[PDB]
Amino acid sequence: TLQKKIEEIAAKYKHSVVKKCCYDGACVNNDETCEQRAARISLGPRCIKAFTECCVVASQLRANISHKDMQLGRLHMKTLLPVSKPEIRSYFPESWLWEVHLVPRRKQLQFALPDSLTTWEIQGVGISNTGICVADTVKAKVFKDVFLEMNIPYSVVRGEQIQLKGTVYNYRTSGMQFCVKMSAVEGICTSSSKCVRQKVEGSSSHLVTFTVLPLEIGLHNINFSLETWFGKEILVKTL
Amino acid sequence: EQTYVISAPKIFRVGASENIVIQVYGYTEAFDATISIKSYPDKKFSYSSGHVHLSSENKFQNSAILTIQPKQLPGGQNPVSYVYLEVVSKHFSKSKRMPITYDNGFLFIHTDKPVYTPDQSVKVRVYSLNDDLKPAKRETVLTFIDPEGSEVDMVEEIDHIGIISFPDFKIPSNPRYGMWTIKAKYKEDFSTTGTAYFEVKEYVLPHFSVSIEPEYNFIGYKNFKNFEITIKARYFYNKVVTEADVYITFGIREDLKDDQKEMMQTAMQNTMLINGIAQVTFDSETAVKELSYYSLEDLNNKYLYIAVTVIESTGGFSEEAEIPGIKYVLSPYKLNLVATPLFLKPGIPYPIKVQVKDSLDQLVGGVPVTLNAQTIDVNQETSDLDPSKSVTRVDDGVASFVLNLPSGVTVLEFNVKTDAPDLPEENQAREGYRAIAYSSLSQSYLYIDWTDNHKALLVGEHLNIIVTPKSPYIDKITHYNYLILSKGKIIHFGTREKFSDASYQSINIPVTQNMVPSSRLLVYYIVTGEQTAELVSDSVWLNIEEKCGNQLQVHLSPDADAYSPGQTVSLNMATGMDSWVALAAVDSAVYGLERVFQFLEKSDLGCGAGGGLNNANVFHLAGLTFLTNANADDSQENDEPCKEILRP
Amino acid sequence: EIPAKEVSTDSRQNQYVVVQVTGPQVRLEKVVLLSYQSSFLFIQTDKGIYTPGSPVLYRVFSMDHNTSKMNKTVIVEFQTPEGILVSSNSVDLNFFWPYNLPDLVSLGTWRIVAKYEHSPENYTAYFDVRKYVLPSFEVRLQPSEKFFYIDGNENFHVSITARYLYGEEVEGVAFVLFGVKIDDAKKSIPDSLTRIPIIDGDGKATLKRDTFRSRFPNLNELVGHTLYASVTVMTESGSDMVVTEQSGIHIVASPYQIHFTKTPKYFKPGMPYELTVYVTNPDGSPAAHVPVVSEAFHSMGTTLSDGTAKLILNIPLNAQSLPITVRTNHGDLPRERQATKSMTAIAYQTQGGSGNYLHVAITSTEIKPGDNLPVNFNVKGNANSLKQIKYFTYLILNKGKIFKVGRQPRRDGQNLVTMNLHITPDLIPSFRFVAYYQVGNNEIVADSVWVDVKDTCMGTLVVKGDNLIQMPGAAMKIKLEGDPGARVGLVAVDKAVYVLNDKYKISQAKIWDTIEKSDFGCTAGSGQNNLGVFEDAGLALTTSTNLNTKQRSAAKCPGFIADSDIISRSDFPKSWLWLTKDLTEEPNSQGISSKTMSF
Ligand SMILES: COc1cc(C(=O)O)c(NC(=O)N[C@@H](C)c2ccccc2OC)cc1OCCCC(C)C
Numbered sequence A: 001t002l003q004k005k006i007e008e009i010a011a012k013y014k015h016s017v018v019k020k021c022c023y024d025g026a027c028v029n030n031d032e033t034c035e036q037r038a039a040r041i042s043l044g045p046r047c048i049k050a051f052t053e054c055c056v057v058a059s060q061l062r063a064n065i066s067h068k069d070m071q072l073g074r075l076h077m078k079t080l081l082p083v084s085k086p087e088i089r090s091y092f093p094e095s096w097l098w099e100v101h102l103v104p105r106r107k108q109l110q111f112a113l114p115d116s117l118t119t120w121e122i123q124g125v126g127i128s129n130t131g132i133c134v135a136d137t138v139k140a141k142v143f144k145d146v147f148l149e150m151n152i153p154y155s156v157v158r159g160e161q162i163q164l165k166g167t168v169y170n171y172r173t174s175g176m177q178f179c180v181k182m183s184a185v186e187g188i189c190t191s192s193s194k195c196v197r198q199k200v201e202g203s204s205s206h207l208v209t210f211t212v213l214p215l216e217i218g219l220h221n222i223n224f225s226l227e228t229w230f231g232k233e234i235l236v237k238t239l
Numbered sequence B: 001e002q003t004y005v006i007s008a009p010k011i012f013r014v015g016a017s018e019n020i021v022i023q024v025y026g027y028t029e030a031f032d033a034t035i036s037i038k039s040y041p042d043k044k045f046s047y048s049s050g051h052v053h054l055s056s057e058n059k060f061q062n063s064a065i066l067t068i069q070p071k072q073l074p075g076g077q078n079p080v081s082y083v084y085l086e087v088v089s090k091h092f093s094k095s096k097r098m099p100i101t102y103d104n105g106f107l108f109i110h111t112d113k114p115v116y117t118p119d120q121s122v123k124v125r126v127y128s129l130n131d132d133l134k135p136a137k138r139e140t141v142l143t144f145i146d147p148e149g150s151e152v153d154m155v156e157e158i159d160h161i162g163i164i165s166f167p168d169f170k171i172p173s174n175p176r177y178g179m180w181t182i183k184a185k186y187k188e189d190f191s192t193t194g195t196a197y198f199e200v201k202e203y204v205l206p207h208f209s210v211s212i213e214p215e216y217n218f219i220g221y222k223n224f225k226n227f228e229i230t231i232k233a234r235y236f237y238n239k240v241v242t243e244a245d246v247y248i249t250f251g252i253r254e255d256l257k258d259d260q261k262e263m264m265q266t267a268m269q270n271t272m273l274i275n276g277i278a279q280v281t282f283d284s285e286t287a288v289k290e291l292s293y294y295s296l297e298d299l300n301n302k303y304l305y306i307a308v309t310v311i312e313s314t315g316g317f318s319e320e321a322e323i324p325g326i327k328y329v330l331s332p333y334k335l336n337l338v339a340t341p342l343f344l345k346p347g348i349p350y351p352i353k354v355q356v357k358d359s360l361d362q363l364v365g366g367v368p369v370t371l372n373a374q375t376i377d378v379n380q381e382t383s384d385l386d387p388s389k390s391v392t393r394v395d396d397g398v399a400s401f402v403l404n405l406p407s408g409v410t411v412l413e414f415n416v417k418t419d420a421p422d423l424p425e426e427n428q429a430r431e432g433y434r435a436i437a438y439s440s441l442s443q444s445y446l447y448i449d450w451t452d453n454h455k456a457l458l459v460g461e462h463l464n465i466i467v468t469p470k471s472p473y474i475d476k477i478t479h480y481n482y483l484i485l486s487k488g489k490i491i492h493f494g495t496r497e498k499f500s501d502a503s504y505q506s507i508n509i510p511v512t513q514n515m516v517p518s519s520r521l522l523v524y525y526i527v528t529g530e531q532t533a534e535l536v537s538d539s540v541w542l543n544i545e546e547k548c549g550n551q552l553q554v555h556l557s558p559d560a561d562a563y564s565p566g567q568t569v570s571l572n573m574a575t576g577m578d579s580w581v582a583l584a585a586v587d588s589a590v591y592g593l594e595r596v597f598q599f600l601e602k603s604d605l606g607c608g609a610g611g612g613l614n615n616a617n618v619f620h621l622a623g624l625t626f627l628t629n630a631n632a633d634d635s636q637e638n639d640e641p642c643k644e645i646l647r648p
Numbered sequence C: 001e002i003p004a005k006e007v008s009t010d011s012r013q014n015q016y017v018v019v020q021v022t023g024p025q026v027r028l029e030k031v032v033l034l035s036y037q038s039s040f041l042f043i044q045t046d047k048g049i050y051t052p053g054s055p056v057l058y059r060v061f062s063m064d065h066n067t068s069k070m071n072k073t074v075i076v077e078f079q080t081p082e083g084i085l086v087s088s089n090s091v092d093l094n095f096f097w098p099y100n101l102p103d104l105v106s107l108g109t110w111r112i113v114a115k116y117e118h119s120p121e122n123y124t125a126y127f128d129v130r131k132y133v134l135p136s137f138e139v140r141l142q143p144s145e146k147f148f149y150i151d152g153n154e155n156f157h158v159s160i161t162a163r164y165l166y167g168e169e170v171e172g173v174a175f176v177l178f179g180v181k182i183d184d185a186k187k188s189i190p191d192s193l194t195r196i197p198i199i200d201g202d203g204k205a206t207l208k209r210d211t212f213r214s215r216f217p218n219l220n221e222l223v224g225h226t227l228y229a230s231v232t233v234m235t236e237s238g239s240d241m242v243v244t245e246q247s248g249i250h251i252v253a254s255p256y257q258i259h260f261t262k263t264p265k266y267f268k269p270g271m272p273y274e275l276t277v278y279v280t281n282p283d284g285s286p287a288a289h290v291p292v293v294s295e296a297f298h299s300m301g302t303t304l305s306d307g308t309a310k311l312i313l314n315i316p317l318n319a320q321s322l323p324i325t326v327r328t329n330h331g332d333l334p335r336e337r338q339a340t341k342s343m344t345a346i347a348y349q350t351q352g353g354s355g356n357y358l359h360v361a362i363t364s365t366e367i368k369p370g371d372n373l374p375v376n377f378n379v380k381g382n383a384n385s386l387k388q389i390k391y392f393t394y395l396i397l398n399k400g401k402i403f404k405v406g407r408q409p410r411r412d413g414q415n416l417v418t419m420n421l422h423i424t425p426d427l428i429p430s431f432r433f434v435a436y437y438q439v440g441n442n443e444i445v446a447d448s449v450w451v452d453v454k455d456t457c458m459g460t461l462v463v464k465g466d467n468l469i470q471m472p473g474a475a476m477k478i479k480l481e482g483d484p485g486a487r488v489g490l491v492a493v494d495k496a497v498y499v500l501n502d503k504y505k506i507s508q509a510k511i512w513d514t515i516e517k518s519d520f521g522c523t524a525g526s527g528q529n530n531l532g533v534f535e536d537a538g539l540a541l542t543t544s545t546n547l548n549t550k551q552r553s554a555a556k557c558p559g560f561i562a563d564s565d566i567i568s569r570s571d572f573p574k575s576w577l578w579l580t581k582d583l584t585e586e587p588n589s590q591g592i593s594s595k596t597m598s599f
């Protein structure tokens, strides 16, 4: 690994001011040559030479070098970057139940849990004349064992045979049985609804494919009702 | 003989209500005294005064509550740094220079989520209390500090209820990513500050989420030869990648704030993913041979930076992951002292309780600890003790030792050391301490002993404390006098008489809702000779349970272990009295807080588990000062950034 | 060690043994009463109630300890409710067969007795047999109060919560007849039977106080007897009924009843005195959070989870008998309701009026196997006699055996000298701490204490699962995370037959109550003199100066589916999974060898 040149061409720009100019010179641009894409650089000639002399040494090192070899050099070139940018790979929704309330020794309030599969935590802080009392936390773990969700596209053109892909998931270790049916509407022309029994493996998934052909233009309504061994759940979708 | 002890807190707080306890002894004719705080250095402007009646029905003990309001102090060009606690009666007239501070109250800032993404709203509210732990009703000026240290938004709000709801801070569509900071502040008269941190991170979504979950979160002596690292990748809930291509690289790091990393350009592995899971190993010793380091003595408190790029076989996508640091640790343990004062009493046993914490703060039980001790008496003659071993118990991580010291001890030099079975004695954690005996002219001591030390005190029940003197004038002692402190305020006092010829006796004390997080108890007596008298004192630190004054509890109805997305439930709050309840429903996957009593206890003055070098050090380390005939305080009011533990 | 083979004399009379210690200038002799070999057998049946004809299958354990004559075999016997002994088998503790019940055999509480060969004691295990069906739901009866005031003015409510076995709320109708039960037979109150609409498993029955007073106006007949409530609930479809009974509600004029019985009846003058009160409920269950006082000494405490509250009393030194009085000052009660009791403590008598005492003082509660409890050795006496004592000899008596004995050095000047004692799990359920010292080679001064360790297991056993819903006939996995080398037995019992007869089952609480009745101590503390400590602890003592304890008399001291596809559910057992697993898996670092089992 790191054949000969990859260790030397990166250590030269290990503590350079234009090490980032060398880093994006070695990126794969198949339809532009080395000088053809260097002309649009405007950061001075010092960054151009760090670009080009890291660009020519990778097109040579991609002819007779392995696929396994060059994708190890993609990780060796990682230290020519600025340090790891702050990013998160999750999206946490806007936190509900954010209010204060005056409680005369007992109070009840009701609300709808949001359409999300995550384990909430409700904590309460009571400020009164005696002091502060952080209550014992409670959880609101909305957790379905077998559930579907459909990949409804955002925008369907009128007159297309749309295949509505969806996937059932089965968190349980024992594989079980299910059937999904679709609420036909007057607009949707789909190719009383029969239940055909498919079967998910344990701790796995299973694809669900419907097909529609819409005719009317607007915001329609399609209800996907997965009826597994643990009841019947209607999932309401807007196409 | 006629003496008196007038006990005040160590530092007056401006705007507080400080309790000043006066106890006089050896009197028969009842009388009165005026405790008054005068200004400095003139004694002209009297801030507040009090009147106490020292009569026989009170057992010659009373207390006035004094108060320095902020509207009577010259601000602007300076703060006031000293006052005079002055006492005048027909039998005594003393005065002491007392420092004052403006650090009044607490500010807890509570944002809902710790990590935000762009175009989301930072919800924020401030729980404001004063130093008597009640709703402060003062105006608070929030400040929003970006990573660039800029005042990007300074919003202020008035308080009426104790919970100061602020408008929601809107993270922009393009923010400055990094650690932000919210700084709360009273607008006037007080130097109280609160600080809350949150993070702004850019949202990108992966084709599959790659995690790197290694074996242990620190490497010492057993993963220094083989370190099994596991890499997992999955698209969604259960959709897992089938094949992929894994390339790993490793590097040595100094600390997580210095972002320069010296990569080991020989340890770049290459494996294959098989339906999600690949187990790789990293022989650390042979791989750190470049940038030599040669040992586990070196690389100590250094990190390992593991970068992983998993390239999917089917679609061709390449998701990256990283670990910022796995600490290359020398010994897997850290030893400290839980609730041991480093002060002796001559002729009285010395209980030592060490705690074995691992290098990421867990209470590792079953870990054999060995104690060696050395008696250095008054004549500088080191005498060795027998070594004693014990086992760290798994419930709180605390081993227990007891040394029965000889009668003429002056300095104990004891060294703890782990005796784990499968580590070398250069990779065993060790610590060394030094305990100094309590000094007193006409050598006479006090040892107060809490009965149930192991379990926390329950409010409403009764504390039972056993008091032993070790005087040569034992039959001259008449009264045991005590003081109970909580949050730097004297909340109780009293006087139990001494049973005439019982060598030691027990005091019974009720534990109330004044002393909820913890408390101190300073007991003393007065042994008078033909010379000046002397107070002989000792103190302990108590561990009263966490029982709030009106017990809030919340419930969900119906209480199931699984809900439906869209299910209407009812939240059933139920307090003990009238209260303002603040609610927050946070998605618990952000945590990967609201601990308050470990911060609300920082109003306590003085540290350690009690004890002192002389009489006045016992009063000073409990968070008290005093003025007598018998002894003087003479205590240097320096900084002393002490670091004691007191709790498992 | 004494071999039991030599002991052949008939067990209506006792046997003694002299213990003769001969050596250089040493001849000592103590005569000691014998006993038989201790052995605790426990019987575990699968379910508590059977059906005539169905086989009863049982399981016998032991607390086996070390000997060599390991040919003592267990005799297992089944007995009719009229005491007719049917079977008697010399079973083997590895693999023994069940007992098939006859088809037309008697209905009632049977017995299983298990005893060793030539052992005179046994262990009983009960099970009913009757013609029943599984009751298909379950009733929890929670009363208002644990007690019932014999002269009050308030109504008694018994709330009814009926749930199905699979955890759904029963909707139906209940019949609640109250009544006052004397020791064996019931005397009902027929004007007090009601009918409640049970709505979503909720509804309570109120016993009006005048309706009770109209039946028993003579308050002298309500002396120390129970009040029941026979609840009979029926569902809305009329499909089935169950009958429950909230019994045990006592008719007393005080909510609490205190006994001393755990505190030493002997104090030392000058030292404090550790008084362990014991506040129980009227049946015998311990009472928690009950504040007691003792107004003659201004001390007051609060009972713990085991119903004890240690008070420390500051004694005057010039007293040789101590009248004390404890009264439970509970919070929201009126003054005339609270319990009270008095006692007198007889002072320790030193060897010749010398005034040399010893107060071993253990003050630590909720002691688990695994702590280090600190124990203080307090001395008191003439300052020349305290000058010449160097060590204490402490010893630990568990299950009537000297489990451990060490020494504790006292360097001079130390009146208080303490020790950490590590509670090993061999000390469950309790132990005694006898300690002494001697001065002048002439006089020994002793003291003991009784320490209550928490009655947990000596090892561990946790059955572990995912704790969620299953389907009928699905595959399940559970984990038997236990101590290694064990022989884990197993049974899976329906809840309809578990909660129907939850009285004869074995638990860890009932196991230690059979071993805590096997120690030879008579009180829970010191004695009148230095010999009265060693007698009252279950010890013997001999000296070279001829100071001997009293003789021990006895061993107890005073569009549808096609129906070719729906496989019908047909396997309905009441108990199954009668397995025996042997944990041979590798122990983890904490010591818990786990096995995953599937079924
Ligand atoms: C940031 O620098 C790189 C980017 C990339 C990138 O994916 O854009 C890269 N990838 C890459 O070679 N793939 C291989 C499989 C390949 C081989 C042959 C033909 C086409 C290929 O690509 C589709 C390598 C890179 O640096 C390696 C050392 C160069 C330096 C040391 C001069």
Ligand SMILES: [Mg+2]
Pocket: C429, C430, C452, C453, C454, C455
């Ligand atoms: Mg017990």
